[PDB]
Write an enzyme that holds these catalytic residues in place. Structure first.
Site, PDB file in Angstrom:
ATOM      1  N   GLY B  18       0.851  -1.262   0.000  1.00  0.00           N
ATOM      2  CA  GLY B  18       0.000   0.000   0.000  1.00  0.00           C
ATOM      3  C   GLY B  18       0.858   1.272   0.000  1.00  0.00           C
ATOM      4  O   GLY B  18       0.601   2.191  -0.766  1.00  0.00           O
ATOM      5  N   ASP B  19       1.876   1.333   0.877  1.00  0.00           N
ATOM      6  CA  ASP B  19       2.603   2.565   1.010  1.00  0.00           C
ATOM      7  C   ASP B  19       4.119   2.422   1.395  1.00  0.00           C
ATOM      8  O   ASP B  19       4.637   3.340   1.974  1.00  0.00           O
ATOM      9  CB  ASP B  19       1.912   3.400   2.098  1.00  0.00           C
TER      10      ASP B  19
END
Lengths: 153, 153
Positions: B18-19
């Protein structure tokens, strides 16, 4: 009443904590008894070249849809009943966005009574604002922002 | 080396997809045999109000460090041996960043030979570029960009 696989939930919670969105909004709408309507949205966004990952989420979650927004796309789940069932199962694994998920569930469990009571509705409005603050968004609007929301609707 | 718990790996892999960032860089450095040095970085970034999550990752991963930038902070793991052990264990769960992790591993396993062979080192340079492209970063530099990297060093 879909029951999700725990290893999927663990991976998806970390994915959500890193980059997913749990959002609630109150927007002006003259058709509603209190002249505003609530929207609740679990959202994951990726560049369009990885839209397969979003279409895969639709297959895996069994509900929700993908929308294009040019160079990015989103997976959107906004239906209340499937959203409640999904966030109830994801919540125990969230570490950064668990409070947002808890508030969306609280809001959803309050909607039958918010349909008729001004007090119940206004209290939903306070939880909407608590979600925005947790999301580092603005929870207060200037007079121009309020009127502009009305005009946009 | 250390063996990580699987549910932590599943959650952290989704968080990384995701990040998180799996990054490699080649920067000019006169003291190296081929006049450039490799840096390999696993990085997670959060707002400073959630720095506790990053300090927690240091406790849980057992290695790495937290640095403050402005309104943000990073957890950084850049030491080779612990980085290899960590990405070997996380890789099977990555869905979007698995190829970056595998190229970092391949680079690290090539480092003893890249120390003495120009050909081995230049091949590591090609894997650095493949990671950059997978990261949607630029893999080619103009003459001004190349000279500026020299000047910055």
């Amino acid at each position: 009443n879909t029951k999700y696989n725990k290893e999927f939930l663990l991976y998806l919670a970390g994915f959500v904590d890193g980059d997913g969105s749990i959002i609630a909004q109150i927007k002006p709408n003259q058709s509603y008894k209190f002249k505003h309507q609530l929207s609740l949205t679990f959202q994951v966004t990726q560049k369009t070249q990885r839209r397969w990952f979003l279409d895969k989420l639709v297959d895996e979650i069994g509900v929700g849809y993908v929308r294009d927004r040019g160079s990015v796309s989103d997976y959107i789940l906004s239906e209340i009943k499937p959203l409640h069932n999904f966030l109830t199962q994801l919540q125990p694994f969230l570490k950064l966005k668990q409070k947002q998920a808890n508030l969306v569930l609280k809001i959803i469990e309050q909607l039958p009574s918010a349909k008729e009571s001004p007090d119940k509705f206004l209290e939903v409005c306070t939880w909407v604002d608590q979600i925005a603050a947790l999301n580092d968004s603005k929870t207060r609007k200037t007079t121009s922002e309020t009127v502009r929301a009305v005009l946009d609707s």
